[PDB]
C-alpha cells in the first residue's frame, strides 16, 4: 500500500538520486547498509526483507558506467540491490538519438525487467518518480524511450517527473536546446505532472538565502531532494490534512496538458540566520510568492496563477494557514485566473524537515513546499525555443542526430509541438 518506484536516469538523475536516498535513509532511520536499529512509514520507498534489511524501491540507469560505479563503491554500495543499478558500455554523448534509438535500445528491456520486479512487490503502487536532465543524451533520449514503455505497460499509474531544465544563461553543452525540445513530446504525452527545475535559479537561491558564495551540485541536489521528500511526506507520515498523489494532481492540473507546475521551498536558510528570523507560518508562506525563491528563472508576476498546492510540514495549525492564504489573496501583485476562485489546495503534515548532517540548510520547526501551476512558466519555454531556432536555421549540429537513426523531420515536429504547448499556457490565462 502507497508504494512509489523512483527511476533515476543519466548523471543528473542518479546524482539527485544519491541525495534523495541520502535523505530518505535519514528521515526513516535506515543505516547506509539498509539496516534499521530501535510502523510501516518507510514502506512507500523501501521493501523490507526478512533479515531486517530495507532495500529501496529505486532503479538507477545510465548508458555509461562512471556515475553508477561510484554508487556501487561509495557509502550506499550495501543499500541497493546490485541488479537495479543498471549500466551500459557506451555514453549517449549529449545526443538524444543515441539515448533513444541506438544505445538505450539495448538496455531498455533490462530496465523494464527491474521495474516489473519492483511493481510486483507493490500492493497499490501510487506512481513513478522519474528523475532526469532535459539537456542530457541519456536524460532526454533514454527517459523518452522508457516513458513510452511505462505508458503502455502501466497506463493508469501516475508518472511524476523531476527535470533539470536549461537556464537563461548557464549552460554546460552546445546541444542542450536540441535535447530539451526533442523531450517535449515525452512530458506532453507520457507524463502526468512534470516539475521543471533550473540550475541557475538554485545557484541564486544558494547565494541569497544560504549565503554560500560558490556552490557545487551537491548543494543543488540537497534542495531538489528536499522538495520530493515534501511531495511524498503525506504518503509516508501522519498529518492534519494529508494529500494523496492523485489528490495533488486533481488540484494542480486544470486541463489535460497543463501539468507543468513551478516548485519552491521555504525557508531555505543557513544556521547564521535561522536563530534571528521568526520563521512563523505567515513568513514562510509569503516567501513562496517571491520571484527570489522560484526554482526556474521566470517571474510569476508576468503570469497568472491557476492553482497552488501549499504542502506544509512540521509544527503548523490550519488556523495559521488560513490566516496566511488570506493575506496572499489580499495582495494585488499575486494574480490568479478568473476561473479559479478557490486557488489553494492545502496539505499539512506533522513530520518536520530532516537535516542532512553535512548540509548547508538549517534545522527549522516548519517548512512548506509550494507547487504551483502558473502561466509564467511559458517564458522558460520561450527562452529555449529561441535558442533552438538559431541553431536549426543553420542545421547547426543535426548530422550527429541524423547519423544515429533519427528522422530529420522530428526537429520540426518537436519545435511544432512545443509551440502548441506554449500556445496552451497563453490561451488559459484569459
Amino acid at each position: 500500500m502507497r508504494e512509489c518506484i523512483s527511476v533515476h536516469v543519466g548523471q543528473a538523475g542518479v546524482q539527485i538520486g544519491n541525495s534523495c536516498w541520502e535523505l530518505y535513509c535519514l528521515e526513516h532511520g535506515l543505516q547506509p547498509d539498509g539496516t534499521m536499529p530501535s510502523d510501516s512509514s518507510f514502506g512507500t520507498f523501501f521493501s523490507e526483507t526478512g533479515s531486517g534489511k530495507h532495500v529501496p524501491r529505486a532503479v538507477f540507469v545510465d548508458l555509461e558506467q562512471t556515475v553508477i560505479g561510484e554508487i556501487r563503491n561509495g557509502p550506499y554500495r550495501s543499500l541497493f540491490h546490485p541488479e537495479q543499478l543498471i549500466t551500459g558500455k557506451e555514453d549517449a554523448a549529449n545526443n538524444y538519438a543515441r539515448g533513444h534509438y541506438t544505445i538505450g535500445k539495448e538496455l531498455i528491456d533490462s530496465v523494464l525487467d527491474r521495474v516489473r520486479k519492483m511493481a510486483d512487490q507493490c500492493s497499490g503502487l501510487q506512481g513513478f518518480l522519474v528523475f532526469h536532465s532535459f539537456g542530457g543524451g541519456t536524460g532526454s533520449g533514454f527517459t523518452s524511450l522508457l516513458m513510452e514503455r511505462l505508458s503502455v505497460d502501466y497506463g493508469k499509474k501516475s508518472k511524476l517527473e523531476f527535470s533539470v531544465y536549461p537556464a537563461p544563461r548557464i549552460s554546460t553543452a552546445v546541444v542542450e536546446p536540441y535535447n530539451s525540445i526533442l523531450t517535449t513530446h515525452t512530458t506532453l504525452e507520457h507524463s502526468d505532472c512534470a516539475f521543471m527545475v533550473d540550475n541557475e535559479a538554485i545557484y541564486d537561491i544558494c547565494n541569497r538565502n544560504l549565503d554560500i558564495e560558490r556552490p557545487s551540485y551537491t548543494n543543488l541536489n540537497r534542495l531538489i531532494a528536499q522538495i520530493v521528500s515534501s511531495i511524498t511526506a503525506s504518503l509516508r507520515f501522519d498529518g492534519a490534512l494529508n494529500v494523496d498523489l492523485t489528490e495533488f494532481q486533481t488540484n494542480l492540473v486544470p486541463y489535460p496538458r497543463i501539468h507543468f507546475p513551478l516548485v519552491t521551498y521555504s525557508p531555505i536558510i543557513s544556521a547564521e540566520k535561522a536563530y534571528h528570523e521568526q520563521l512563523s507560518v505567515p513568513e514562510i508562506t509569503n516567501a513562496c510568492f517571491e520571484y527570489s525563491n522560484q526554482m526556474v528563472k521566470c517571474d510569476p508576476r508576468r503570469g497568472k496563477y491557476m492553482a497552488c498546492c501549499l504542502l506544509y510540514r512540521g509544527d503548523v495549525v490550519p488556523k495559521d494557514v488560513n490566516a496566511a492564504i488570506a493575506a496572499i489573496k489580499t495582495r494585488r501583485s499575486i494574480q490568479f485566473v478568473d476561473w479559479c476562485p478557490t486557488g489553494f489546495k492545502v496539505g499539512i503534515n506533522y513530520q518536520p524537515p530532516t537535516a542532512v548532517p553535512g548540509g548547508d540548510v538549517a534545522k527549522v520547526l516548519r517548512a512548506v513546499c509550494m507547487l504551483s501551476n502558473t502561466t509564467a512558466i511559458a517564458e522558460a519555454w520561450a527562452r529555449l525555443d529561441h535558442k533552438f531556432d538559431l541553431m536549426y536555421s543553420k542545421r547547426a549540429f543535426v548530422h550527429w542526430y541524423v547519423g544515429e537513426g533519427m528522422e530529420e523531420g522530428e526537429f520540426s515536429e518537436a519545435r511544432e509541438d512545443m509551440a502548441a504547448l506554449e500556445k496552451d499556457y497563453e490561451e488559459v490565462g484569459t
Binding site: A93, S171, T172, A173, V174, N199, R214, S216, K394, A396
Partner: protein, 426 residues
C-alpha cells in the same frame, strides 16, 4: 569499458607518444617496470582504458609503435619508460621515409601497413568495448604524414563507428627543419579532413612561444615541447579515466565541438602554466585558470583567435571546484568577448569537471578550441606549397614513387576547400 588504442608514427609521433606514456603512467601510478605502485583505487579503477592486465599484476600499455627506421624504436625502447611496451607492438622497417610522403603512403609504409594493421586487430579484439583510436604524428616529413594517414585510412575503413582522434604536430614558417614540409602536409591534410572525427592541430612555433613567454625557460628542448603536448592528451580523455561532476567522453566532446562534419580541426591549450620561479605568488583558482586558458598566448597553434571567431570551445576542468564558479566564468568569457564567438550558436562553451586534478596541482584545465582562425594555419601551408609547386620543384622525389602531379593539384584543391569552409562562418 571504453578502451582506447593508441598509435605512434615517425620520430615526432613516437616522441610525443613516449612522453605521453610517462605522464599517464604517473597519473595511474604505474612503475617503469609496468608494476602498479599508486596511492589510490581511482588510479586502478580505469587502468584498462590505456593498458592491458598481464600476469603478476603487470600492466602493458595499448600502444602500437610505428616507424620506417629502427633508430626511434631503439631510442624509445632504451628510454625512461621504454621497457613498458609490448615487444610485438614495435612494428618497423629498415630504410626510412626520406622525408617523402609518397614513400610513407605508397612504397616503404605500404609494405609495412599489413604488419601494423594486424597488431591493431590484436589490441582492438582484446578490448571489452573500444571507444576509439588515438594517433600521434607530425604532418611534416614522410613517416607520420604519409604512413600515419595511410594507417588512418585503413583503420577508418575497418572501424567506421569508433572515434578516430589524432594529435597532429604541423608546419609553420618561422620554426622549420625541412625544405619539402609544405608538400608533405598538404598531401596529409587531404586525408585528415575526410577520415578523422577530431584532429588536434599543434605547432612548434606556438609550443616555443609557451616556453619563452609563459614558462620563461632559457633553453626549451623537444622534451619540453613534448611535455606540453602530452598534458593536453591526458587532459581530453580524463572523463573516461576518473569520476567527475560533469562527465564528457571523446564522443560527448565531438557532438558538441563539431557543428558541420569537416570543421573538426581543433587547437588545444592547458592551464595553469606558471614561470618556474613564480608559483608561490599565484592564486590557483577558476577565474585565473580562465584568464590564462582563453588568452591567445596559451593556445598550441600559431593562430591568434583574435583573427577569427570560435565555433565551440570545450573547457575540461579537473579538481575540487564549484559548478556555479565554472558556469559563471564560462558565461562571463563569451559575453565580455562576444565578438570572438559565432552568434548563430546560443552558447559556444562546453564544460566538463573531473574530481581528480593532475598529480601535484590543486586544479587544472585542458582547453579545446574550434575556431575560424585555424584558416591561417591551412592558408600559410597552402601558399608555401603554391610557391614551390608553380615551378614543379622537388616533384621527381614524389613522382619517382609513382605519385601523379594530379594528386598535388587535388590535395591543394581540397586544402583551399577546407580554408573556404572555415572562412565561410567568419
Amino acid at each position: 569499458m571504453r578502451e582506447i588504442v593508441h598509435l605512434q608514427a615517425g620520430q615526432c609521433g613516437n616522441q610525443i607518444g613516449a612522453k605521453f606514456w610517462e605522464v599517464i603512467s604517473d597519473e595511474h601510478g604505474i612503475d617503469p617496470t609496468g608494476a602498479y605502485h599508486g596511492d589510490s583505487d581511482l588510479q586502478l579503477e580505469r587502468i584498462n582504458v590505456y593498458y592491458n592486465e598481464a600476469t603478476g599484476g603487470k600492466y602493458v600499455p595499448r600502444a602500437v609503435l610505428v616507424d620506417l627506421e629502427p633508430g626511434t624504436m631503439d631510442s624509445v625502447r632504451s628510454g625512461p619508460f621504454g621497457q613498458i611496451f609490448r615487444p610485438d607492438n614495435f612494428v618497423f622497417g629498415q630504410s626510412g621515409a626520406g622525408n617523402n610522403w609518397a614513400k610513407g603512403h605508397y612504397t616503404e609504409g605500404a609494405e609495412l601497413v599489413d604488419s601494423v594493421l594486424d597488431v591493431v586487430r590484436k589490441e582492438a579484439e582484446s578490448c571489452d568495448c573500444l571507444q576509439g583510436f588515438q594517433l600521434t604524428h607530425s604532418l611534416g616529413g614522410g613517416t607520420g604524414s604519409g604512413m600515419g594517414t595511410l594507417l588512418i585510412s585503413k583503420i577508418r575503413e575497418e572501424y567506421p563507428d569508433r572515434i578516430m582522434n589524432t594529435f597532429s604536430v604541423v608546419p609553420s614558417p618561422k620554426v622549420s627543419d625541412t625544405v619539402v614540409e609544405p608538400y608533405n602536409a598538404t598531401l596529409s591534410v587531404h586525408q585528415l579532413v575526410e577520415n578523422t572525427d577530431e584532429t588536434y592541430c599543434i605547432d612548434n612555433e606556438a609550443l616555443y612561444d609557451i616556453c619563452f613567454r609563459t614558462l620563461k625557460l632559457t633553453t626549451p628542448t623537444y622534451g619540453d615541447l613534448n611535455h606540453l603536448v602530452s598534458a593536453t592528451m591526458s587532459g581530453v580523455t580524463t572523463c573516461l579515466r576518473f569520476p567527475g561532476q560533469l562527465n564528457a567522453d571523446l564522443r560527448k566532446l565531438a557532438v558538441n565541438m563539431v557543428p558541420f562534419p569537416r570543421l573538426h580541426f581543433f587547437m588545444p591549450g592547458f592551464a595553469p602554466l606558471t614561470s618556474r620561479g613564480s608559483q608561490q605568488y599565484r592564486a590557483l583558482t577558476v577565474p585565473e585558470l580562465t584568464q590564462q586558458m582563453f588568452d591567445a598566448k596559451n593556445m598550441m597553434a600559431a593562430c591568434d583567435p583574435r583573427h577569427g571567431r570560435y565555433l565551440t570551445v570545450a573547457a575540461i576542468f579537473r579538481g575540487r571546484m564549484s559548478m556555479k564558479e565554472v558556469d559563471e566564468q564560462m558565461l562571463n568569457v563569451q559575453n565580455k568577448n562576444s565578438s570572438y564567438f559565432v552568434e548563430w550558436i546560443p552558447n559556444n562553451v562546453k564544460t566538463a569537471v573531473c574530481d581528480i586534478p593532475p598529480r601535484g596541482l590543486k586544479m587544472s584545465a585542458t582547453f579545446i578550441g574550434n575556431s575560424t582562425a585555424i584558416q591561417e594555419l591551412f592558408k600559410r601551408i597552402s601558399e608555401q606549397f603554391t610557391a614551390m609547386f608553380r615551378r614543379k620543384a622537388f616533384l621527381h622525389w614524389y613522382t619517382g614513387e609513382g605519385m601523379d602531379e594530379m594528386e598535388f593539384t587535388e590535395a591543394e584543391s581540397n586544402m583551399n576547400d577546407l580554408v573556404s569552409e572555415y572562412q565561410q562562418y567568419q
